[PDB]
Amino acid sequence: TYIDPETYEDPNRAVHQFAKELDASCIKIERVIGAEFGEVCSGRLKLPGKRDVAVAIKTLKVGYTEKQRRDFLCEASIMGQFDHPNVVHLEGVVTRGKPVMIVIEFMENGALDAFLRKHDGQFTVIQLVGMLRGIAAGMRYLADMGYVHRDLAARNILVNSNLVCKVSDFGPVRWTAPEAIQYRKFTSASDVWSYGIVMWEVMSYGERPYWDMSNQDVIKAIEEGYRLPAPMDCPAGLHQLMLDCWQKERAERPKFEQIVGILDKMIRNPNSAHH
Numbered sequence: 001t002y003i004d005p006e007t008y009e010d011p012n013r014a015v016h017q018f019a020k021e022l023d024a025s026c027i028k029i030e031r032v033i034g035a036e037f038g039e040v041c042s043g044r045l046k047l048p049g050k051r052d053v054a055v056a057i058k059t060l061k062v063g064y065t066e067k068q069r070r071d072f073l074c075e076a077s078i079m080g081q082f083d084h085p086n087v088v089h090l091e092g093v094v095t096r097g098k099p100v101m102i103v104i105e106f107m108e109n110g111a112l113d114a115f116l117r118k119h120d121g122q123f124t125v126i127q128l129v130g131m132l133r134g135i136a137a138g139m140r141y142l143a144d145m146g147y148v149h150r151d152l153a154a155r156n157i158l159v160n161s162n163l164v165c166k167v168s169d170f171g172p173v174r175w176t177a178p179e180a181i182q183y184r185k186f187t188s189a190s191d192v193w194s195y196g197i198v199m200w201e202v203m204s205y206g207e208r209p210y211w212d213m214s215n216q217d218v219i220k221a222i223e224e225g226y227r228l229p230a231p232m233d234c235p236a237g238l239h240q241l242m243l244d245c246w247q248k249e250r251a252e253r254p255k256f257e258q259i260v261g262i263l264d265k266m267i268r269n270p271n272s273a274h275h
């Protein structure tokens, strides 16, 4: 089961429990790939006897306080509790004595929303469904561990060379269930609403949910019963599942295990996605 690292009297204890300390000299930074806390780089990590693995390296820019280090490292305390093929994997951390780092499996194709926009129209229904199935499997794992994501969005899904999609978080009214927006009720059931939004993002190749509508106009429309339509070439049964994820009454939304089951049926018989 997931443990909130902030139930720990000392935040550093959580870091040392769930995140392996790495030797800095075994880490090679190669290129900058992103700009919070510091730069994000790609590189390699040396493993004894094994070939080097490609990693993403999140750095803590120098001049930080004790306090800033704490919040940065909290992420490793969270990540390192998970072990699932559709949840991004923590290799480890450098916490003292050397430049502070979080070291993560490298995901070549980056964030799923930008990836899809770049490859607009290039994936078959079955391929897009495989991507959604991976995300759903990652969420099913997280939900079962008692972890509520709270910011599930295609921008928070990472893609590797093999098109495998993994749940991540880069640290959002249009992705959020109404009960979470209004009453701050964040649960796996509110993550299911977010997932429905992710489904829409994927089937539309990284279009912005609700396009140019203001946050207040999104909230109002949702309250009035508005729901986003099926994207171009999106089968009716996939859109129906989006509609199910977007039920006002959270108890009526499917569970992730049911979502995976439904997508599996679609991968097994592609025709059952239209009905």
Ligand SMILES: Cc1ccc(C(=O)Nc2cccc(C(F)(F)F)c2)cc1Nc1cncc(C(N)=O)c1
Residues within 6 Å of the ligand: 033, 034, 040, 056, 057, 058, 075, 078, 079, 082, 087, 088, 104, 105, 106, 107, 108, 109, 110, 111, 158, 167, 168, 169, 170
């Ligand atoms: C640099 C980076 C930063 C944050 C994360 C990440 O997913 N962090 C995270 C934070 C809180 C919770 C979770 C979790 F695992 F989803 F629950 C993940 C991953 C990465 N890894 C990564 C790997 N490959 C490419 C990139 C990129 N292109 O930015 C980024």
